[PDB]
């Protein structure tokens, strides 16, 4: 049943269904139609055309409404000949149009094929649907397999990178990204799911232990990362560079986990419609009689920070069960049955904080009148209740050389409190990571196969801090591959006796980088950090600064005309205006000592080593204190670079057809500016200055030969084997690159050549 037998799951899931004949008696067209618009404003809504007058001005294309419109060569979206609706590979379209482009993967969808190459893109359109694609039949079906040997699929791109390493010796690394909830995440855990069983170390068929481990991590990361949320009910809140480690044999040996960007806000505010991250209501719903009075537990409505979301228990599935999993995998990678319980009591006492409400007193300064839920909350963590009381409303200050007690309002006294659950949680998961490692990650790791799971550009309501770091680490990814797009196009260009001439980019990205982390002049990143570090600066201050030294004075820069706190940055995507308001506050991550000295010596083997070991509780020390949240990101990101530009990338872009899923509903508004969000079509484009026809070496002398007097069938050597039907039939040097020693094909003004009888 390999790609042979016709009534596979492999051809009837991944494959065009295949007809029969293949000569004069197969659909064939001896016409021509374009891609033209029924609104003339409205761009993301086409129609079939008709081309009925050509002169080499404007197309006079006919319509469906009986009406003739007209267009140049500047918009004339010239469709494709149908023979190549539903191509695996868009690199062969003779037309690169949007709407070509968008048409294709249309058709592609329609029959259930998600899977598409897009030049050396591999892109995926989310199906809302269970496609049978992913048994272990499918995996040993893919195994030794090659691009353009299968059809498109993540084990094809997984199985590519696995064997490229075993061959070139090198390392290797995958990038996939796009929209949250549109593929990804589970496009990734595909690539492990995969990886586990070609380089498998199991007797028989399974794991060796070791595996599991791995493929265990998974669901523990999720309990504490993911929840439901408008785009998916999955939908993961942190970034991951997952490190697959092997030996030189191309074993599994081990593998490392990274973090980035945790949504620390979603603790303590969900939004309408969504919800909290799932460990909680694992943990409510599983927890045994006796569990739920030891952590003094209630329902999962009766905590502030899981009611005011007018959602709690999601459609679909259980909690209690898939609670059994989360403990399940923890005690599979090994966490002591009272490590875990540990894990839970802070679980259990965020939820009391949280049940805190505040209540004004004598004056200005609050007042916990009733002080139920803090006792609990500072029950399960091990502190002392009275400290931890008015070490939370009556925290010191070091003005001047005075360290003097202080009462705060309700505002100051609550913002403190969300403050202190907050660095819990991202410290929690922080440790989870951490622990994973050790027992995963190795020393003497041979080789590695990485894969970068994390969103690209995105455009929210309200553009914060946290959407300057994705666009800023996205600027650098983007650069990344047009870069890349260089060494490759120019090797290609050297076996081919003729060389192109010397062709350069220098990446007009290079621009928003600098306006971003630039040093001198400084940039944003830099003149955010020097207004850190100041006791007093305010928000106001802060955006007077770039204002004065970016507005008319720099190209990616711009000044609202009535907007008092943003401005806008122009990225590789296009504008994004960014809102100020609390980026002094969250550039430092504030705590204030007290509650952090009061922490720092509790009863628990867990709950400290988050506030006792500075590997977890503090950041590089350079100079004055530690350093700033951007500060550490900009150096986080540098440090992923260095490690992918030692590798060989791939690159998997993921698609949300649709912002209801639902299954079978393609929105052209929404798919169709979502292929400019990236670029995968652009990618492409670059290669249009020389073939825009890329595939394997030459077919035209091993695919056709019925044509009339003009070349053979069968000739002597691939390059000029077809030395007619190409050249003497209008053609000079002028096309294909093709000298005496290896190119690629040429097809833009093919449809010349044949179209009609043989």
Request: charged share 25%; proline share 3%; glycine share 6%.
């Amino acid at each position: 049943n390999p790609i042979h037998d016709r009534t596979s799951d492999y051809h009837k899931y991944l494959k065009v269904k295949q007809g029969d004949s293949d000569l004069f008696k197969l659909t064939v067209s001896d016409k021509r139609y374009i891609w033209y618009n029924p609104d003339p404003k409205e761009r993301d809504s086409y129609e079939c055309g008709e081309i009925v007058s050509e002169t080499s001005d404007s197309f006079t294309f006919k319509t469906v409404d009986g009406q003739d419109r007209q267009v140049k060569k500047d918009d004339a979206n010239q469709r494709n000949p149908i023979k190549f609706d539903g191509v695996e590979d868009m690199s062969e379209l003779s037309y690169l149009n949007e709407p070509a482009v968008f048409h294709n993967l249309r058709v592609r969808y329609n029959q259930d094929l998600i899977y598409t190459y897009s030049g050396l893109f591999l892109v995926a359109v989310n199906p809302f649907k269970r496609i049978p694609i992913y048994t272990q039949e499918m995996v040993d079906i893919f195994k030794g397999r090659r691009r353009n040997e299968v059809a498109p699929h993540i084990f094809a791109i997984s199985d590519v990178a696995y064997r490229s390493m075993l061959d070139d010796r090198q390392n290797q690394s995958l990038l996939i990204t796009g929209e949250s909830g549109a593929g990804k995440t589970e496009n990734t855990k595909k690539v492990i799911q995969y990886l586990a069983s070609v380089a498998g170390r199991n007797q028989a068929n399974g794991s060796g232990v070791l595996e599991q481990q791995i493929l265990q991590a998974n669901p523990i990361l999720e309990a504490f990362g993911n929840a439901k949320t408008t785009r998916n009910n999955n939908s993961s809140r942190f970034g991951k560079f997952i490190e697959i480690q092997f030996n030189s044999a191309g074993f599994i040996s081990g593998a490392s986990i990274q973090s980035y960007l945790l949504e620390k806000s979603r603790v303590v505010f969900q939004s309408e419609t969504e919800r909290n991250y799932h460990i909680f209501y694992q943990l409510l719903a599983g927890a045994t009689a006796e569990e739920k009075k030891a952590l003094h537990l209630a329902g999962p409505e009766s905590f502030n920070y899981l009611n005011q979301s007018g959602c709690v228990d999601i459609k679909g599935v259980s909690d209690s069960e898939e609670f059994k999993i989360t403990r399940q995998a923890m005690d599979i990678v090994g966490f002591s049955q009272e490590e875990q319980m540990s894990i839970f009591k802070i679980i259990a006492g965020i939820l009391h904080l949280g049940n805190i409400k505040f209540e004004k007193g004598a004056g200005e300064g609050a007042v916990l009148k009733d002080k139920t839920a803090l006792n609990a909350a500072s029950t399960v963590f091990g502190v002392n209740p009275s400290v931890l009381e008015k070490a939370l409303m009556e925290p010191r200050i070091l003005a001047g050389r005075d360290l003097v007690a202080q009462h705060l309002n309700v505002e100051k006294s609550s913002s403190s409190r969300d403050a202190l659950v907050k660095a819990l949680y991202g410290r929690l998961f922080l440790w989870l990571v951490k622990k994973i490692n050790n027992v995963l990650c190795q020393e003497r790791k041979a080789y590695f196969i990485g894969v970068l799971d994390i969103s690209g550009f995105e455009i929210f309501k309200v553009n914060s801090f946290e959407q300057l770091c994705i666009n800023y680490t996205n600027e650098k990814l983007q650069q990344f591959f047009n870069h890349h797009m260089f060494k490759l196009e120019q090797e290609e260009y050297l076996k081919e006796k003729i060389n192109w001439t010397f062709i350069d980019f220098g990446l007009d990205s290079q621009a928003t980088i600098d306006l971003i982390d630039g040093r001198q002049p400084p940039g944003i990143l830099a003149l955010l950090d020097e207004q850190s570090v100041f006791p007093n600066a305010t928000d106001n201050t802060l955006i007077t600064k770039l204002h004065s030294h970016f507005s008319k004075k720099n190209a990616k820069y711009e000044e609202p005309r009535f907007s008092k706190t943003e401005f806008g940055v122009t990225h590789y995507a296009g504008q994004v205006m960014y809102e100020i308001q609390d980026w002094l506050e969250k550039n430092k991550d504030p705590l204030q000592q007290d509650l952090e000295l009061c922490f720092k010596d509790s009863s628990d083997n867990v709950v400290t080593k988050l506030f006792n070991d500075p590997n977890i509780a503090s950041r590089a020390k350079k100079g004055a204190n530690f350093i700033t949240v951007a500060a550490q990101y900009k150096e986080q990101l540098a440090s992923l670079m260095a490690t992918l530009e030692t590798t060989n990338p791939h690159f998997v872009r993921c698609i949300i057809p649709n912002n209801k899923q639902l299954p079978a509903k393609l929105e052209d508004k929404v798919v169709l500016d979502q292929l400019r969000c990236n670029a995968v079509l652009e990618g492409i484009r670059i290669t249009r200055k020389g073939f825009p026809n890329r595939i394997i070496y030459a077919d035209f002398v091993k695919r056709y030969y019925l044509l009339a007097p003009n070349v053979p069938r069968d000739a002597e050597d691939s390059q000029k084997a077809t030395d007619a039907v190409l050249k003497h039939l209008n053609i000079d040097p002028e096309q294909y690159r093709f000298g005496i020693t290896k190119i690629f094909f040429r097809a833009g003004q093919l449809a010349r050549i044949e179209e009609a009888r043989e």
